[PDB]
Structure formats: C-alpha cells, structure tokens
Amino acid sequence: TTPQEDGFLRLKIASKEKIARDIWSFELTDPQGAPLPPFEAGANLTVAVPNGSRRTYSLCNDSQERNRYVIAVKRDSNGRGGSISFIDDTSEGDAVEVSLPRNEFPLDKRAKSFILVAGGIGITPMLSMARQLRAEGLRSFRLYYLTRDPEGTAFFDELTSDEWRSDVKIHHDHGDPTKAFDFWSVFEKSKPAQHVYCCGPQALMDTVRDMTGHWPSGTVHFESFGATNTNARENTPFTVRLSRSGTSFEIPANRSILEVLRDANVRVPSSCESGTCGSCKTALCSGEADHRDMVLRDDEKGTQIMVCVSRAKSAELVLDL
Ligand SMILES: Cc1cc2nc3c(=O)[nH]c(=O)nc-3n(C[C@H](O)[C@H](O)[C@H](O)COP(=O)(O)O)c2cc1C
Ligand code: FES
C-alpha cells in the first residue's frame, strides 16, 4: 500500500533549514498553493521519508495558518534510519507525501491557564500550543523548556526574544544530570482549572508525573515520542508466518514487520510508527518477540506484538493475521 493509496497528500518542501545542532526545520506547502487541511495545536502528521519509512512529526506553526505545515526533525544517528533519511536525502523543492493531520494532543477547552513543559525536541507540540494560546489571546501560559545548551536548543533565538521571554523559561543542564531544574516550586500549588502538558524524554515525564501526584485528576497530560531507541548491537533478519493468511515473509535487518506487511498489502492499522499509539497491536501465536514498544505491559508481552517497532528473539514468529 503506497502513501497515495493510503490517502497521503503530495506536498512540496518549500524550505529546509538547520535550526540547532542536529535539528532541521521543514516548511511544507501544497505545490499549487492550495490551502491545506486544518489542524489545531498538538496535532501530528505522518511523512513518507525518502527510504520508504513513515515517520510522525508534530506541527509547530500557528494553527490559524492555512498555507503551510512546519515540522522540526532531530537527526537520530542511533535511530532506525528514518530521521537520517529525511534529513540527509531531501532537498528544498522536493515532493514529499504527508498524511492528514491527526488531532491527538489538544489543548483543553475549559482550562483557564497552562503550564507547558518541553524537553529537547519535545518542544514541537508545546510550541504549537504556545502559538495558539497567543493567537487566541485569552488564557495565560508558562513554558518551561529544558535542553542541554543553547546550540542544541531549537527555536532558541525566537523564544529568547522580547516577544517571548516573559512566558518561557529555558534551563540548560549542560550534560550534567546533577544540574537539575526545580520542578517542585513549579508544581507545589495547583491553581484551579490549571492544566499541565508535558512532552520530553521519559525521565522528564516521570519527574513531572511524580511532582503532580497531588494535582486534580485529569489536569496533567503527556505525549511520548517513543521508546529510547533500543537497537541492541545489531538488528537481525527473522521470518514471520501469518496464521490465517497462510503466507510467510522474511523481515530483513533494516525493515520493520509493518513495512514488510504493508508491501504485501496486509492491512494493519498504524499511525505513530513509534510504538506509542497502540494501533498496530497484533496477536503473536508463537515465538519470542523482542518488544521495543511503550503500550504493552509485561502481562501481554507473550501473546501480543506492536509490529511497527518490535522484532524477534526467536528465529520465527507466527502472527494471527
Ligand atoms: C506523536 C509523535 C510526535 C513526534 N514528533 C516528533 C517531532 O516533532 N520531531 C522529531 O524529531 N521526532 C518526533 N517524533 C519521533 C519520530 O516519529 C521518530 O520516531 C524519530 O524521528 C526517530 O526515527 P528514526 O528512528 O527513524 O531515526 C514523534 C513521534 C511521535 C510518536
Ligand atoms: S503504529 Fe503506533 S504503536 Fe505501532
């Protein structure tokens, strides 16, 4: 199933700039200048990258714009190849196929104020929320932004400008785990109808979760960008047998099960491709899966598999497809 058969739109890379160490910004427009599908803050879309992989990125431009989508992609040298492919093998002017935006992490309508916490490239959904709150002009926010140093901080100059410096607080730990930010002062008292949104490394999100254990239920919201890339020394090929379809596929070292099945036109629901959304859950009839996801707790880890990220510890898996 190609991106086009899957409903992707053909956009054009209007602008590609390096904006921090290892982080690039892309501006995507319709090639004939047509208005794009609407989105709101927190929305994600999937991009077909030049190597054939599909990767999900947050929209970080003002949601009142109809003419472009802006994403910021960190190049992951230890990743699966997708961000490397999108950063290295694209040029300005290239066509790129892109899904409709998915409204997956929205600002609460009834909240009156916001604490936004971004770690690293987790800036992108928090920025879109900050932009939208500004454009709306009604509710106040504070953005806490935690990165390593100014050079590796996306949107540093904009968010340190006069326009923003009152509402965003940037902390650099300079690579010392011990240079920690005081979150307890931030979360000590809960204001009424004050919500917290957090996007960052799992360790940052855990901390914000532990500091807000006393906040009212349903006022603290998290979005994960996916597991801490566990590419353990190598990736090895294995075989996948399908139980109902009666077919078999070899999964090579550099492709996911999902990518191989999708080429065979086996229709498995997928959105995130990062093992966080839970859609691609598949029954495992036999075999030791090597789980690399975030949605399966120990208690289904012997009978289910997120085909978008996980591989095999046995030489063969048998999936109920
Ligand atoms: C909801 C969601 C949003 C994401 N947003 C971004 C983003 O804005 N920028 C980014 O660099 N990675 C983002 N990611 C991670 C990418 O989808 C991808 O996993 C990452 O670029 C690593 O891929 P690679 O292993 O192929 O290098 C997001 C993941 C999810 C699940
Ligand atoms: S597609 Fe989201 S977890 Fe696999």
For the chain, the structural domain boundaries read: 1-104, 105-225, 226-321
Q: Is there an atom of ligand 2 within 6 Å of 275 CB?
A: yes
- From its phi and psi, is residue 160 left (phi > 0), alpha (psi between -120 and 50) or beta? alpha
Cβ atoms 203, 173 nearer than 8 A: no
At residue 243, the 3 state secondary structure works out as coil
Tell me the torsion sign for CA atoms 265, 269, 271, 275.
Answer: negative
To test ligand 2's pocket by mutation, which of 46, 104, 272, 294 has the most ligand atoms within 8 angstroms of CB? 272
At residue 208, the 3 state secondary structure works out as helix
Cβ atoms 15, 92 nearer than 8 A: yes
Report residue 231 as tokens.
């590419």
Q: Is there an atom of ligand 2 within 6 Å of 279 CB?
A: yes
Residue 205: partners with Cβ closer than 8 Å, 6 or more residues away: 119, 198, 199, 222, 224
CA atoms of 235 and 312, how far apart (whole Å)? 10
Give the 3-state secondary structure percentages of the chain, helix then strand then coil, rounded to 5: 15, 30, 55
Residue 281, number of CB atoms within 10 A of its CB: 18
Paired with 115 in beta bridges are 142, 196
Measure 24 CA to ligand 1 centroid, in angstroms.
13
- DSSP class per residue in 8-40: -EEEEEEEEEEEETTEEEEEEE-TT-PPPPP--
Paired with 93 in beta bridges are none
Residue 132: partners with Cβ closer than 8 Å, 6 or more residues away: 40, 41, 62, 63, 64, 107
Paired with 29 in beta bridges are 12, 68
Of the candidate CATH numbers 1.10.357.10, 3.40.710.10, 3.40.50.80, 3.30.365.10, the domain formed by 105-225 belongs to 3.40.50.80
Per DSSP, 125 falls in state H
What are the binding residues?
55-56, 72-74, 80-83, 124, 225, 272, 274, 277, 280, 308
Residue 267: partners with Cβ closer than 8 Å, 6 or more residues away: 1
Q: Is there an atom of ligand 2 within 6 Å of 282 CB?
A: no
Per CATH, is 1-104 categorized as 2.40.30.10?
A: yes
CA atoms of 174 and 23, how far apart (whole Å)? 17
Instruction: State the residue for tokens 């053909």.
Output: 10
- Strand order through the sheet with 54-58: 54-58, 44-48, 95-98, 9-20, 23-29, 68-74
Cβ atoms 24, 17 nearer than 8 A: yes
CA atoms of 71 and 27, how far apart (whole Å)? 7
Cβ atoms 82, 51 nearer than 8 A: yes
CA atoms of 17 and 31, how far apart (whole Å)? 19
Considering every ligand atom shown, identify the ligand nearest to the alpha carbon of residue 125 and give its number: 1
Q: Whose CA is nearest to atom 2 of ligand 1?
A: 225
Measure 189 CA to ligand 1 centroid, in angstroms.
33
CA atoms of 54 and 271, how far apart (whole Å)? 9
Report residue 15 as tokens.
């602008």
Residue type, 222: F
Q: How far is CA 282 from the centre of its chain?
A: 21
Q: Which residue numbers come right before each break in the chain (C to N over 2.5 Å)?
A: none
Instruction: State the residue for tokens 């809960």.
Output: 190
Alpha helix (H) ranges present in the chain? 82-88, 123-136, 156-159, 183-187, 202-211, 257-263
CA atoms of 116 and 131, how far apart (whole Å)? 12
Residue 68, number of CB atoms within 10 A of its CB: 17
CA atoms of 261 and 290, how far apart (whole Å)? 18
CA atoms within 13 A on the CB side of 139: 19
Per DSSP, 190 falls in state P
Quick one: resolution in A? Answer: 2.0
CA atoms of 29 and 14, how far apart (whole Å)? 6
Q: Is there an atom of ligand 2 within 6 Å of 259 CB?
A: no
Closest ligand 1 atom to the C-alpha of 79? 25
CATH architecture of the domain 226-321 equals: Roll (3.10)
CA atoms of 211 and 208, how far apart (whole Å)? 5
Bridge-based pairing state of the strands 289-290 and 311-312: antiparallel
CA atoms of 199 and 51, how far apart (whole Å)? 27
At residue 156, the 3 state secondary structure works out as helix
Residue 15: exposure state from Cβ atoms within 10 A (0-12, 13-18, ≥19): middle
Instruction: State the residue for tokens 């932004």.
Output: 145
Residue type, 317: L
